[PDB]
RNA sequence: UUUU
């Protein structure tokens, strides 16, 4: 079938669409090569479609059939509870979208009474409409990256397809627990979302060593939101159904199956018909937690008939990476091809053919990977890093544009080891926020998905217990990863990195002088930048009040938001 | 204006 069906009614706006870097006085200091930055806008949402729109062939074979019965039976463990609509009430982010009757994001998490008034009634018909397709609406979303090598290639628009907002709120009240037990259940370990980014680079490791001669590599499927059949999603929902379900829960994820995940009609930010999208809608609760399972199921699937030897696979949504044991080059490059054609016939073609990977440092998935430095005494230490360019090009465009959600704040927790978050994201913007003091002020930044208020007086003790004492002390980083940064700095015109120790040595001693968590992080965030670095012993709250919950399971798309850590 |  066709994954979308277009009426010309087109995808349109509802706010100004910025799309050139404005010449900010802050922005280069960050960033000399403006013009390297851009953001998609709506104009170009067409080219976006086209690349989606397309038919879907698949085919199940015995290996998914057998599979699928195997992640059922660890299904059948997990028992989920309905949520209460206080609970999915104060999920909702303080900033969702808003509801075409009359009533947002504040009025939800308030509880107003024309809101749950709502919400109520939409649970209602959720029990008693079983056919009716849910109306959804499709938006551009705005997204900034740094201009292909190419001179002009641009990424078009990416597309959000997400229902009402009292429609979201009950979908958290019938599966977020679902989505948030029930993977991890079903795949073990290879659920990736459990992890910290620690976690995450332990896991690849440990994984990495138990084979005697490794293979390691990854498959990016193509438009994976459009691979999937409303096969794949009435599968997901056999799934679900394996839990201990409360009957309006149960009925629930029926009724949204059969009327909103597997598909439904299109409407534009103005009213109009767009169309109809019969795959996956990229802004559903479901959304991850479905593409983790569909990767998971047809890779499980795909391997077996590939013949990969003892495959250890680590599955994010549509990410995924898989490591086995090698049977020789000429071997191996014959089974990745095989795994493909599997892959393919389950209706999940690759955008770039898989390669299989003998340097561990070398596969790469999730754009970032696997790199190794120093700690303080030097005993070699693993963290996991990414090339830096749209991480330096969203926080260049943030400084110059204030965004609701600052993309920077979320590198710096993730990525806090790696040699630019440390010594350009962190020195930039502590500069910028004690430069108006804004210390205290929270921030709104986003993990796997869920969104996160945050005071950026806390990173030492979060990025502490997401990474440890060495997030602080590491040295020795790799010369290919110093090329990697170097070189993107280059690129987008900023200056070398040595150059900021000086610009660093400062704002860290205008925090010190300011005592308290303020001085915490002059003393651990910036001990980079003194010629003489003093030792730093644990942070007392750091591991104390160490709220959690925070890697539990992705919910990119899910409209969540959680507000803990201080 | 919503956060895959
Ligand atoms: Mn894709
Ligand atoms: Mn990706």
């Not at 997204?143 to 429609?167: M, N, S």
């Not at 890779?299 to 086995?324: F, H, P, S, W, Y």
């Not at 590198?411 to 790696?418: F, Q, R, S, V």
Request: proline residues 5%.
């Amino acid at each position: 079938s066709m994954s979308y069906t277009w009426t010309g009614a087109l995808i349109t706006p509802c706010a100004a669409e910025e799309s050139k870097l404005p010449i900010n006085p802050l922005s280069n200091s960050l960033l000399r090569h403006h013009n390297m930055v851009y953001a998609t806008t709506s104009r170009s949402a067409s080219l976006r479609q086209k690349k989606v729109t397309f038919d879907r062939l698949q085919v199940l074979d015995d290996h998914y059939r057998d599979v699928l019965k195997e992640m059922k039976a660890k299904a059948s463990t997990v028992k989920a509870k309905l949520l209460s609509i206080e609970e999915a009430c104060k999920l909702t982010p303080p900033h969702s979208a808003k509801s075409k009757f009359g009533y947002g994001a504040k009025d939800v998490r308030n509880l107003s009474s024309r809101a749950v008034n709502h919400i109520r009634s939409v649970w209602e018909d959720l029990l008693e409409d079983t056919e009716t397709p849910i109306d959804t609406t499709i938006m551009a979303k705005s997204e900034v990256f740094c201009v292909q090598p190419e001179k002009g290639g641009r990424k078009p628009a990416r597309l959000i397809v997400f229902p009402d907002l009292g429609v979201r709120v009950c979908e958290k009240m019938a599966l977020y627990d679902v989505v948030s037990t029930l993977p991890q259940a079903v795949m073990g370990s290879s659920y990736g979302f459990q992890y910290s980014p620690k976690q995450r680079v332990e896991f690849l490791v440990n994984t990495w060593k138990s084979k005697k001669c490794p293979m390691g590599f990854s498959y990016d499927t193509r438009c994976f939101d459009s691979t999937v059949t409303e096969s794949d999603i009435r599968v997901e929902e056999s799934i679900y159904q394996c839990c201990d379900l409360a009957p309006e829960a149960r009925q629930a994820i029926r009724s949204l199956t059969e009327r909103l995940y597997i598909g439904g009609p299109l409407t534009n930010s103005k009213g109009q018909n767009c169309g109809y999208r019969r795959c996956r809608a990229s802004g559903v609760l479901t959304t991850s937690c479905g593409n983790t399972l569909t990767c998971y199921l047809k890779a499980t699937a795909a391997c077996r008939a590939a013949k990969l030897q003892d495959c250890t696979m680590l599955v994010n949504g549509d990410d995924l990476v898989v490591i086995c044991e090698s049977a020789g080059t000429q071997e191996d490059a014959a089974a990745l091809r095989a795994f493909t054609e599997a892959m393919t016939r389950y209706s999940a073609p690759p955008g770039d053919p898989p390669q299989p990977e003998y340097d561990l440092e070398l596969i790469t998935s999730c754009s970032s990977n696997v790199s190794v430095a120093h700690d303080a005494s030097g005993k070699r230490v693993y963290y996991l890093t990414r090339d830096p360019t749209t991480p330096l090009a969203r926080a260049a465009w943030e400084t110059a544009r204030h965004t609701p959600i600052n993309s920077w704040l979320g590198n710096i927790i993730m990525y806090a080891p790696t040699l630019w978050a440390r010594m350009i994201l962190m020195t930039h913007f502590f500069s910028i926020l004690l430069a108006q003091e804004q210390l205290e002020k929270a921030l709104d930044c986003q993990i796997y998905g869920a969104c996160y208020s945050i005071e950026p007086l806390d990173l030492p003790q979060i990025i502490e217990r997401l990474h440890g004492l060495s997030a602080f002390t590491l040295h020795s980083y790799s010369p290919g990863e110093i090329n990697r940064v170097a070189s993107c700095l280059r690129k987008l015109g900023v200056p070398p990195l040595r150059t900021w120790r000086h610009r660093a040595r400062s704002v860290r001693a205008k925090l010190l002088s300011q005592g308290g968590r303020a001085a915490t992080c002059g003393r651990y965030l910036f001990n980079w930048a003194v010629r003489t670095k003093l030792k730093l012993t644990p942070i007392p709250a750091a591991s104390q009040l160490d709220l959690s919950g925070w890697f539990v399971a992705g919910y990119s798309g899910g409209d969540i938001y959680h507000s803990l850590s201080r």
